[PDB]
Amino acid sequence: CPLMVKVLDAVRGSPAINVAMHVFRKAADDTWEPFASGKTSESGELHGLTTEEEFVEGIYKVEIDTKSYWKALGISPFHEHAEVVFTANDSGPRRYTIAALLSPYSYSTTAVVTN
Amino acid sequence: CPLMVKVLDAVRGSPAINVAMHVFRKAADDTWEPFASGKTSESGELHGLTTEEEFVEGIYKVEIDTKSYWKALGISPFHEHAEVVFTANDSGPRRYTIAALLSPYSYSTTAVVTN
Amino acid sequence: CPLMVKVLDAVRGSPAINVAMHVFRKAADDTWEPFASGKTSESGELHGLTTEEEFVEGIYKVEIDTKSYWKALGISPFHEHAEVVFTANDSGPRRYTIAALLSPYSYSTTAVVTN
Amino acid sequence: CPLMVKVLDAVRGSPAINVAMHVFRKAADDTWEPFASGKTSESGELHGLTTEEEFVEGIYKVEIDTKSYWKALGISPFHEHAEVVFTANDSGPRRYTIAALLSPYSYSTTAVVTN
Ligand SMILES: Oc1ccc(/C=C/c2cc(O)cc(O)c2)cc1
Ligand SMILES: Oc1ccc(/C=C/c2cc(O)cc(O)c2)cc1
Ligand code: NA
Ligand code: NA
Secondary structure (H helix, E strand, C coil): CCEEEEEEECCCCCCCCCCCCEEEEECCCCEEEEEEEEEECCCCECCCCCCCCCCCCCCEEECCCCCHHHHHCCCCCCCEEEEEEECEEEEEEEEEEEEEEEECCEEEEEEEECC | EEEEEEEEEECEEEEEECCCCEEECCCCCCCEEEEEEEECCCCEEEECCCCCCCCEEEEEEEECCHHHHHHCCCCCCCCCEEEEEEEEECCCCCCEEEEEEECCCCCEEEEEEEC | CCCEEEEEEEEEEEEEEECEEEEEEEECCCEEECCCCECCCCCECCCCCCCCCCCCCCCEEECCHHHHHHHCCCCCEEEEEEEECCCCCCCEEEEEEEEEECCCCCCEEEEEEEE | CEEEEEECCCCCCCCCCEEEEEEHHHCCCCCCCEEEEEEEECCCCCCCCCCCCCCCCCEEEECCHHCCCCCCCCCCCEEEEEEEEEEEEEEEEEEEEEEEEECCCCEEEEEEEEE
């Protein structure tokens, strides 16, 4: 799995299920080009975003719609979204897991990068 | 001072000093308009970005140049920047403190919103 | 798996491998009684700490030896250990995943609790 | 003020006010001796715990009563407390700021250590 995103809910102590996100890749004109998207599963995970051949060097942005997630729970959150912007594959293919831990006024994110 | 940003370094146990950041505000055409910028002080704080009169309702993005910070310490970090996107002042004027805690492959961010 | 611990390294962007930890359970005299222990695998995970029948209501403490982990990497960390203290199984059995994200001067921890 | 603790609430986007905490110091017999205690102010800060003369080399534990804080808001949280265990002043006197960011099922903590 070249790119996987895992989302956790720090308020309820659960996977964050049905969280929508889009992935973009920076174009030569510095605009954000659509690249991938999906919703987290019942495990809070989004697999199958891309393939090794398609996922080449670039700057990528994962934009996670945390606002809709909290609004569905009756909570007015701080952020419009959680976004994770990173260069990928600059030294050739790697596997990336992006994790995001969500609270109404805070988020934490980390990456696990494996060869 | 209706908007303050504080940045901390989780590797060295220190304020993150001389960290650059840019603040944008979403324009009516959905583009990001430059709003303010600056660098953190020896306390890791950036004060004086805006004024009560200038800091109107809107969607704001704070883009913290974490990459240059880590590269100056000899570390190749994961993220291009740490970004915080939020709606401000939609129920009237508030004071915002945005805090960010930085590691090479991770960041955590929270907001303190006061009336 | 009634109790699993997952440990991540925010400096290197990797699972935290070979991280030792002990689990204790609070006794009636408020002392900490040994309960379980182990080291994280190459995935940063420690499975098989306990069984459903043995893991009953109590206050549990997971004490993760983060100091030895950082010292092995030539880093002088802040904490002696990362500890996670929680009541478990007070409403009958649950499955617990405890995650810890480690930096030299900081740690973040969350729990996923499932029925 | 060689030791200060600041506590933030990630659910409400506010300082965590009136949060109790106890500080212990490890005695020669490996027991935890009471060292200081207090409650956070309206800014989420607890100042004046100790003095330069009293704050000697040692292993210290800060135990933050996060459980009572969440219970007072109607939330049944995961942790009994958030705790921070660290060696202080072993290379000479330092000033320590311990920060903790709280959610019902998660906490993040960092230290700022200055000379
Ligand atoms: O601040 C943070 C604290 C904890 C975590 C947990 C991340 C994580 C990543 C995985 O691949 C599996 C998992 O069970 C958890 C992320 C951020
Ligand atoms: O994960 C975390 C993210 C952010 C913070 C903030 C800490 C902090 C410490 C201060 O002295 C002042 C402040 O405004 C914030 C702590 C942990
Ligand atoms: Na390269
Ligand atoms: Na019960």
